Amino acid sequence: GRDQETTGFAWWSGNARLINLSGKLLGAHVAHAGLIVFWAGAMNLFEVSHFVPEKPMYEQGLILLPHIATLGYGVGPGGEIIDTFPYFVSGVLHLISSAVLGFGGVYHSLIGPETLEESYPFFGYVWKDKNKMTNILGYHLIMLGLGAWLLVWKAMYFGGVYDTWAPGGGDVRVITNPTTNAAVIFGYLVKSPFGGDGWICSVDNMEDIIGGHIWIGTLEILGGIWHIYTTPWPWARRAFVWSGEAYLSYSLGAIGVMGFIACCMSWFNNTAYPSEFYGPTGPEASQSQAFTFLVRDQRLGANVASAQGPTGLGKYLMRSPTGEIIFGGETMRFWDFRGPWLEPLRGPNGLDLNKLKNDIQPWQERRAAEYMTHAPLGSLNSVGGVATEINAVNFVSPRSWLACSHFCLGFFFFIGHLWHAGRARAAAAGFEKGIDRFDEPVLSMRPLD
Amino acid sequence: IGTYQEKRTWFDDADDWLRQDRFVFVGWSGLLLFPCAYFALGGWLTGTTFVTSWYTHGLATSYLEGCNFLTAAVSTPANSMAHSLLFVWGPEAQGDFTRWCQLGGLWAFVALHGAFGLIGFMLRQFEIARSVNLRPYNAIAFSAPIAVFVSVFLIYPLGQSGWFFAPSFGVAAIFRFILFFQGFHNWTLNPFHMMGVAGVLGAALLCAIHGATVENTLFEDGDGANTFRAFNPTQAEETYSMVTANRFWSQIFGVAFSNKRWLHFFMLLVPVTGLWMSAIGVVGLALNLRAYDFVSQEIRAAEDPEFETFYTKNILLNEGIRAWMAAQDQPHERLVFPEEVLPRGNAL
Amino acid sequence: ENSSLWARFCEWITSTENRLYIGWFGVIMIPCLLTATSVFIIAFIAAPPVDIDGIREPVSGSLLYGNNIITGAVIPTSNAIGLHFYPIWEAASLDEWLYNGGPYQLIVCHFLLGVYCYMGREWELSFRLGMRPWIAVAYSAPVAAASAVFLVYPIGQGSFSDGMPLGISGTFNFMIVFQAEHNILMHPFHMLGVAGVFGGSLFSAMHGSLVTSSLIRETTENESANEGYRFGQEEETYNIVAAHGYFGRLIFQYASFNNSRSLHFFLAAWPVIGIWFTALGLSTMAFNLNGFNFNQSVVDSQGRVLNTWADIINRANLGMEVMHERNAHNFPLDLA
Amino acid sequence: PNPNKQVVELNRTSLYWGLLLIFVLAVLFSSYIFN
């Protein structure tokens, strides 16, 4: 342990005591990485134990099991769960590995050396050494690069992953032809984030997802080798702060964007986040309602094309602002929704009402009626309707938990960016403890500023 | 004493025991505060735990009924008690405690002992500031929570048809009183609430800015990274650069405080002026002198069937609040609305 | 001379001797917040009415179309557009841009990108003046709440028509409809936000009065006491011991802050953390998480529903939602 | 020869608060006064 007057940090900022303590800081991270693996083991087995097969996966409050289901372990055609034992092996292999990570995290925090600079020169680092920092940055990009090739090997070779856009309904599909075209892969990145684009949250098939992870796997292996054999160039010396709290703040602003991206990823996308496992999206459940009452009222003898609404726009089918035949109602805002149950009914010129008066399939109205009663609105105590709804069901969508948790975590880590990037830029400048009171720089400025 | 040396009576033997520098100051005000404030808090914590509201309101409001912290309350009396003070020796209760609780008389127990508790607490901080020989600005600021309490809990129901339309003492019970004033009084539109928002939400700005401007213009008076250690309250110099603080905001916001005394009085002034103005608006709503309607936009929107503003949307939403809650919000009216006479949009 | 053209421009942008500091965040902020300011004033005064709801009824918000300061607003973008990007150049005519709520999305895109850079240069001048940085962290709480109402709640609900209108009575519509659909009053993060602005108004009056009631006698009764402070004096114009030693007898002695630096941190942290939660509470209800729903929670024997105050809030809630957007809904579930 | 003679002062910052106060009240209340 360590106290305040030997550091200048109180008990409430005492992890800042081990900034320049390389070995204690290593045990801080390995024990924390034990906790991420421990939670992923424990919350997996909690969700395996509380899995009920005669209920949907999204109804049971499961957020980790849809990730293993999206890889295609233990799922059948249409999102039916075959067996739960592949979800059990993923829970134990994290729960056992957490003890190994927990051991060396407790080891380097208590018994291992405080600074591993003089005894273990390969692992030792000073924060201002720009070669060693890029050296450690290069080691972990190769780990992230080889981790990104695990998803590609599992989709191309090791059984495949779940494709919700598969012909014949969604099941596990070996992705034999991943998209390696740079105009397609780097076309998502330069796409606008707004409606009809959705930056990278609209990636609509698994071939772009797996082919995009080929690109992110090679560039991180190549970019890792780039940073092992280079140092930052003099323009990068000129732009960055080279302290350990700066390197944290660089990571906090990068990861706070990623929390915002995965917030809008799980809310909007239904390819990497399949609706059989995560439930319908916000756009999916609202489009499912208009599709449900369109099939309800064709059977009750009504021309849903010629049916005029009370505003005069069209109760069931209206026209998109770019000219596509879409669903009417307040769900005109979600007209750029695409779904694997809905896209069989959709021709070039929007929806095809010839195809939609004669060829509504009975499985499509099964699935769209499921999505209407599992809309991602709920309550904080998991009630499950609009705020004007009685305590009947027990439901909040996983998409509603995944987006709300990761906007909040993405918001605070942007705040953590603003905290530490302000502090590390000021602590490197010398005035993070306060104004010097002898040369206050405002007193050497011209008044009437 | 008194620079003429009379002999001490029993008052002086009582004055120095009350004005004693013990752990908790009693004082002369504590003969009014500590019996009343303990029974407002004791009446609220008993009423939210055990006392029903099934007879005054037709709805359960205690932990023993099934309510939690958000929905339990000490609810107001029925509209049949008018403005009765509901003394337990009163003509309604007549000595029986278990019916005084059922008649909602424990509401007025909390409301009256809370009102004389606020007098006891405001006299407390005149009394301490005269012992400490300070200026009495802490009490003058507490006139504004007394301006809010008296105008809402006391003045407002006296102008209405009874103590029923008072706020009940709860969390969800305040929330309907809030939704009562939107639906019935259009109280967001009232310009005294608008000055009340700008005072309350502008004092929160001044609290956050003055806290952050001080904490980020501090002088480096210590060596370690804990800047809270580099302070002794018996120091004669300022702990933060006011000159740096002025030059910062004069270039960020264009206008900054240059006077430290005007700053802290402006932090005093904004929440007090905000609450005194909003207290005047609730005085106006006691008589139903609402700022409900802009008549020049009601004449136009009735003579032009396509003139829609966000104002006329708000008037339609208040019609929705009025007709859909008042079969259950006002059970004394005994109004039954058939479902076809309540207003209703399309398909909801 | 030796200095280039770009170097003399950098020493002018980062110059602390400008009257309003610019900084590198100000080369974004100033042309953004003069764009959004100019198009706000023109659209608050002279914009033609706007089909907010996408149902081809226009809603007037301009002073020249029969509105006053209270009821006037810059109307949000059309519901037919949704989250689509609708600049001026994606319209055919300028009047089609004005009809579909085009001015709103131009204000909101430049205002949000301007307050992110207002926060950036509050950092920057603190770094140029030798200050500690985190006034920007305090301003991140009204930035997040502005980001919640204009960006994140439209993103969650799928249209900029659900963003907050740029006006007084348009704000009130936004609040009333929000409470019907999400029950914001029963949400704990809004409860913490009210505790931040009621606490932040209590503490502004508390800290503001203890300092005012501890001023050293420097002036007479014929001149204001604000004359007793001199700007730039190095002595400290009030008695912190007398202020601490007054609030100590008022409730408890160890319930006060004898440390004025610790006092002003708590004075900053109570509103900022409270507004941080109600900015996230608004952003969790953006994804329809919603407020606590205790409707028909208390049930007696024989399975019959006892009402509570939450059931009365529901009667006020479902009165608004059967009347909000009264022509939009063709279908019984307001999922949008 | 009254000894109780005083002068009123109003600096420009108090002018700017006073002029702002009566225009913001006129921005606020005149919407109701013109009704």
């Binding site: - | 206008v255 | 002073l63 001199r230 | 006129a26 005149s30």
Partner: peptide, 30 residues
């Protein structure tokens, strides 16, 4: 007519903002 009065009150408020920044009483030190 009243919209002329509304803009005069809004221009007049933005006038005081302009004078309070660029013609403020300058804080004299010492």
């Amino acid at each position: 007519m009243e919209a002329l009065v509304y803009t005069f009150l809004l221009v007049g408020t933005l006038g005081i903002i302009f004078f309070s920044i660029f013609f403020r009483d300058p804080p004299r030190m010492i």
